[model samples]
Target: KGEELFTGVVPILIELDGDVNGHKFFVRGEGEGDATIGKLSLKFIATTGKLPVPWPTLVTTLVQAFSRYPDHMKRHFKSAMPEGYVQERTIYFKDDGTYKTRAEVKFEGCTLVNRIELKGIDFKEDGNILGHKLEYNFNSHKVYITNNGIKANFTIRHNVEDADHYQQNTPIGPDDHYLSTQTILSKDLNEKRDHMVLLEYVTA
Candidate 1:
């Protein structure tokens, strides 16, 4: 039941080497054909049954977001790191002694991603918080190859974290903090392709 409410939404934009595949997406750089800029966006949502207490919803939302670390790294960063490169990740809970979440990523073998700043997050509950919002601005850079055969340079600027509370009587409170992260990627060196790529997405 939860899967039906929160999965399968396509990203608003997917950019490849100066060419955009969706609305309002574009690349900004100069390079020879075969190599350029690349970008992708994904949307995620979750719904939960009303909790017996006010804090469970917050706990559950934080847990679920933390659980996505492995998958997020694999999907977006696995191929970009050098061979033998390893990553260690940690998530921190807020000071509320019950609410708030933070995540960190560290590279073990290479300097590709020495550190990643926290960006905005989206938290939603079916019965406790109502509606909440957070804002963050962190910048990051990553380089990788896309499945579509183009080397990619990617960047991200997180601007919003939308949270929905599902509780009936509880009033949602102000977010303790805002998280923001950004990433950038460069194309492969051996491909001998010279091209520039740029991508931009709507802030939310």
Candidate 2:
């Protein structure tokens, strides 16, 4: 019931499974006709601001944007054929000057201290206290590839020290700062924070 691939050699499909607060969730979809599929999965745990737009809307917008650039990406897909029978092509046309385009961008001396007192919502299960803090610093660098002057692939390395913590359940008081110092610098806790590596594939 998921796909219909009559006289087709390959089919595209997607499946997502997750559990939130012990509640299970799942999603699945399959495309019509023959299309080889590759998936990239991402997971993030963050205490940050809300996203600018909904995820589905953002993905649809990106898909629509790339749909207009068929001429520069035609080599990636051309009727699914036997993988061993044909040589794989580079993401961009060999003569476009974008086929091997690469560059690097870096940021140094990155540090942030954020403290928030939540007032809009209550977490009844989390002791009803609403103060959070994070003092984090990192030096991150990136390497990216371009196709037709558009960003195509990139990877980033982050050497970070994050001290994220929350306040105990206590009555609200004036001048009650959530955290007094950076936990990352604490001799007992520095060993737990880990560095981050990120890789993204944007387009052909």
Candidate 3:
């Protein structure tokens, strides 16, 4: 018996299956009623669970940050979604409209790069908000979602040696003290650098 699931923060009737890793678990529980039974499953959470402070639930958070042009965003997010694009924003709502709400998005992952506050007037908030943020990283490859706003990418680097052996290639620029260069940013999605779909290339 590893650890069982709960009924309320307090579990009265339950049975533990086992723990494979730190994560990975399942449990069975009976409610107050003698005949009723239920099941609980865990993959990305602790076995003991928590009180009130909920983890990622099914609540799919969507923000319609901008709706100025419906037709444009329709096509914007269309390609961006497949490309797993990243978008960043600064917003001010209601009242004085001063302090901005900064956020970022990765369309493919369907999650925010920075944690965003979810609030609505329920059925009264008008159309589901239309708004806009990460490439999400991985162990195997470097990820990048361009600032252009909808093109998730994975990068592979090739460094040159000098103006002779390194200069054997036809490269790009020499800005300041720097020679031909094109920068690529790698990603570290939260802690799990795994799931991904990116269109990555270099400008060398």
Report the lDDT tens digits of candidate 3 across residue range 102-173. Answer: 223222242212232222122112211211001222122222322233322222222211100110111011
Task: Give the runs in model 3 whose Cα sits over 4 Å from its true position.
Answer: 1-76, 92-97, 107-204
Give the clashing residue pairs of candidate 3, or none.
63-131, 64-129, 64-130, 64-131, 65-130, 65-131, 87-133, 104-133, 105-133
Q: Per-residue lDDT of 75-133 in model 2, one digit per residue for the tens? A: 32122211111111112211111111111111111211011111111122222111112
User: How many clashes would you count in candidate 3?
Assistant: 9
- The C-alpha local distance difference test score for the whole of candidate 1 amounts to 0.22
Residue-pair clashes per prediction, in order, are 33, 0, 9
CA-lDDT, candidates in order = 0.22, 0.20, 0.21
Q: Against the true structure, whose lDDT is highest?
A: 1
Worst 10 residues of 2 by lDDT: 57-66
TM-score of 3: 0.19
RMSD of 2: 23.7
Candidate 2 segments whose C-alpha is farther than 4 A from its true place: 1-11, 33-68, 72-204
